[PDB]
Design a binder for these strands. Structure first.
Lengths: 85, 104, 133, 42, 149, 153
RNA sequence: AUUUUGGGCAACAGCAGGUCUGUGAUGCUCCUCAAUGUUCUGGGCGACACGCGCACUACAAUGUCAGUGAGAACAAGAGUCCGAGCGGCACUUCACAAUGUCGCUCCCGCUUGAUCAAAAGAGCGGGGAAACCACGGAAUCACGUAGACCCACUUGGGACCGAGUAUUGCAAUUAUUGGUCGCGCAACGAGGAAUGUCUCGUAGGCGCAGCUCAUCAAACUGUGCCGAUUACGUCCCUGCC
């Protein structure tokens, strides 16, 4: 941080590779990972570190309006996906 | 007849005194042409007072609360005005505000 | 004779001040101060403004005209009383200030020293604790 | 703000309970609840 | 019979009726405004630029229901809470210029009417149109059942 | 989110118009930058120029920059209003200003010394080092512990 | 279904506590006007190396932002009193001023409809007496749904503050308060040795009444909305009979 303090007695957490960006690998990867899991969640995209569960989830929605993954709840937000058939 | 909705409204420092009031007048007024649709009573209003007690300087800065609820009884009559005024000849005690109004 | 103060209070120099009413002169100022006058009427100064004015007269090449005591704390500095000297009450003192022009348009409250200075200071006379007995 | 109350029981700014048009000292109030009709609620 | 404004989700519907005022170019912003503070409570303010329509949608939502809803009511439906600072966590302020705009505009839109020259209550037409809209949106969902029953 | 694969729009971190602009940002606070004090996003000025989340600060287009630079310094030319205008009555123009950059620094020095210079408790209280209220003033200054400390001996 | 519920009440001694800061309860004991009376004025108690005590808030996705939600507790408010405002009258008065009277509106408290504004803010006409009738058929806080942030001080955060407008007040000038827009990356990433309270629609959070109140509380005293471990023992600890 720029902050001098801002950190406690015991707590420790390491960095992720998820970002705002646009990337050949990311996009292409996303296309190949969004099928891949049997259940596909925004969170698993985040977990495969390329793009976080947030915009990666949008990646899922905008792959799932392309059907690539199946949007489950009959609404939004806490929808989820499974790989498409 | 040409009735008067008479509202005799009775608000009182306790419920106690006024009911006595209410009843007796109505009994008196009634008998007979005084015709009343039963007494409705509007919300008992409450007055709260908490005080800083003690002049502890030192010792507990603890504080004590007295209350006065004020009780409202209303009866409406579709009745004669002069008769009302005939029965209205009660000097009545305090703690019981009694208002009489002639709307419709 | 006498010198100069190169100064601009809202786009105005002392001459541009001078061709205003203290009203319009305040228009330049923010809402309370402009309000303050609005809320007012005349000056609270009738004698004071003369004690100022007279002393404003008295000026000589060197030296000064005397100081007008008051307990005041809200005067807007206007050239009309400029070069006068003011005793500002605070209980302890009718603190004295000449109002030259590089003071003008400001409020008296901006020059009234209302306080004693604690700020973990030190004794000047023979003090020791607090004045709590 | 503390100088315009002047307790109608007591001329006081201090010690006076400020409540509903009253102007009595806290003690004076403690003394008066009965004739008025205030009885403990809590 | 069916589903009127009493029966329908603005989550699809205001989002569409907003568009009924948009899409059609009926009223939009007033001359005095188009910037929009949230209201006296916040800078960050309408990410949705359609706020005034949305507003209108919502003032309209009010007006059929609480027929005769005055200026002061609109301030209240406006709502919110404020974290001031190292200070209290207490409820927020509704900006009236625009409130008043919304009032001016839906009556000009003839969906609002100034009931008894005051508190607004709906135009007849408004609510038939609303119910109509309700049905159109309602049927084709990105959820579960019945575009295929 | 898009399926854009781009590196030249993944952009960063550029200091423009005597400001700093970071990558990323919903877009706003990159634009918020330079302080000393309000420099001059207005939020609104920039938001009014046609800038948004659809580019973030991270998209970082030059075109945009030019448009901002243009809108900011005559804000109410863009009708971007004057009723807010961080400075509104100078006192040497006696006016309005969307104040920018180091000229705000300049403005800070001049005005603060005079503002401070004609003195009064109130004046000194903001000035020497205090919060300009809190009744019980010593308690404030918490862990900055040393407001400045003063003795004339 | 248990000394059922929360209280209220509550023995007897006891504690130079505290109680000169109520007291038009006061000993003894001081000044009494070239008084420390009283008014008036003006100041102060609110002054920042620091040591604390409470509180409050942040540090944050468990969140922040933009918006959207058909969520009510509990409970306020219109004093009297024949130059306030207004008005009429009276007389003075070449004209003013004047004075005086009378009357209203009463030195007119809450306040609604709503226009014109960035905006807060300015307003004819209305309405309501503590009024369950106007400010109360709306409108209570964190809910729940759509949108920015692909979790990094992001700016979390706003201490910090700058012009700028509105309001309080005789007076703020020891910024009365608001407002506005900019504006911040202060500290602050949840806090050591220590440590505080707590066992039922409740902890607890979360918010709102109500008054202090010219003007101003994180206080005060309530109201709500939301919403739970094991403890139920043990008597250790630590303490009372």
């Amino acid at each position: 941080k720029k902050a001098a303090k801002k950190w406690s007695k015991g707590r420790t957490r390491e960095a992720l590779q998820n970002a705002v960006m646009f990337d050949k690998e990311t996009m292409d990867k996303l296309m190949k990972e969004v099928p891949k899991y049997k259940v596909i969640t925004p969170s698993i995209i985040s977990d495969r570190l390329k793009i976080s569960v947030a915009l990666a989830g949008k990646g899922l929605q905008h792959l799932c309006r392309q059907g690539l993954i199946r949007l489950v709840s009959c609404s939004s937000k806490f929808r989820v996906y499974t790989r498409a058939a | 007849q040409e009735t008067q909705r008479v509202l005799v409204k009775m608000t009182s420092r306790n419920a106690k005194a006024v009911e006595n009031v209410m009843t007796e007048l109505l009994l008196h007024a009634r008998n007979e042409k005084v015709v009343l649709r039963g007494p409705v009573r509007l919300p008992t209003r409450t007055l709260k007072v908490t005080t800083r007690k003690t002049p502890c300087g030192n010792g507990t800065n603890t504080w004590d609360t007295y209350e006065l609820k004020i009780y409202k009884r209303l009866v409406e009559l579709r009745a004669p005005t002069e008769l009302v005024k005939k029965i209205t000849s009660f000097p009545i005690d305090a703690g019981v505000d009694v208002a009489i109004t002639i709307p419709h | 004779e006498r010198t100069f103060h190169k100064f601009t209070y809202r786009g105005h120099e002392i001459d541009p001040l001078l061709a205003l009413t203290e009203e319009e002169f305040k228009a330049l100022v923010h809402a309370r101060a402009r309000r303050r006058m609005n809320r007012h009427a005349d000056r609270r100064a009738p004698v004071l403004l003369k004690r100022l004015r007279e002393a404003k007269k008295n000026v000589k090449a060197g030296e000064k005209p005397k100081a007008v005591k008051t307990h005041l704390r809200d005067v807007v500095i206007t050239p009309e009383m400029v070069g006068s000297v003011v005793g500002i009450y605070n209980g302890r003192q009718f603190n004295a200030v000449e109002i030259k022009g590089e003071m003008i348009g400001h409020y008296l409250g901006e020059f009234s020293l209302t306080y004693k200075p604690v700020a973990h200071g030190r004794p000047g006379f023979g003090a020791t604790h607090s004045s709590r007995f | 703000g503390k100088g315009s109350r002047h307790c109608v029981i007591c001329s006081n700014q201090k010690a006076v309970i400020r409540k509903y048009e009253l102007n009595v000292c806290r003690q004076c109030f403690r003394e008066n609840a009965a004739n008025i009709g205030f009885s403990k609620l809590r | 019979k069916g589903a009127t404004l009493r029966d329908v989700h603005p989550w699809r519907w205001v989002k569409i009726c907003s568009q009924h005022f948009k899409q059609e170019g009926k009223m939009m912003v007033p001359n005095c405004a188009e910037i929009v503070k949230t209201s006296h409570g916040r800078e960050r303010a309408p990410q949705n630029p359609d706020w005034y329509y949305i507003r209108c949608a919502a003032v309209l939502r009010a007006v059929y229901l609480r027929p005769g809803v005055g200026y002061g009511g609109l301030s209240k439906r406006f709502s919110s809470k404020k974290n001031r600072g190292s200070r209290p966590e207490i409820t927020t302020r509704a900006s009236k210029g625009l409130l008043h705009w919304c009032c001016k505009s839906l009556t000009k839109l003839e969906l609002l009417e100034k009931c008894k020259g005051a508190g607004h209550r709906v135009t007849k037409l408004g609510r038939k149109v609303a119910d109509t809209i309700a049905f159109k949106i309602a049927l084709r969902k990105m959820g579960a059942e019945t575009k295929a029953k | 989110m898009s399926l854009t694969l781009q590196s030249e729009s993944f952009q960063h971190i550029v200091r423009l118009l005597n400001t700093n602009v970071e990558g990323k940002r919903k877009v706003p606070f990159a634009l918020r930058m330079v302080k000393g004090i309000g420099i001059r996003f207005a939020y609104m000025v920039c938001k009014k120029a046609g800038v948004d989340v659809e580019r973030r600060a991270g998209t970082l287009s030059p075109e945009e920059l030019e448009k901002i630079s243009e809108v900011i310094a005559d804000p109410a030319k863009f009708k971007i209003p004057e009723w807010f205008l961080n400075r509104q009555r100078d006192p040497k123009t006696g006016k309005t200003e969307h104040l920018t950059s180091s000229m705000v620094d300049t403005r800070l020095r001049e005005d603060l010394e005079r503002l401070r210079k004609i003195r009064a408790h109130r004046g000194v209280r903001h000035a020497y080092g205090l919060r300009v209220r809190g009744q019980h003033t010593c308690t404030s200054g918490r862990r900055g512990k040393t407001v400045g400390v003063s003795r004339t001996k």
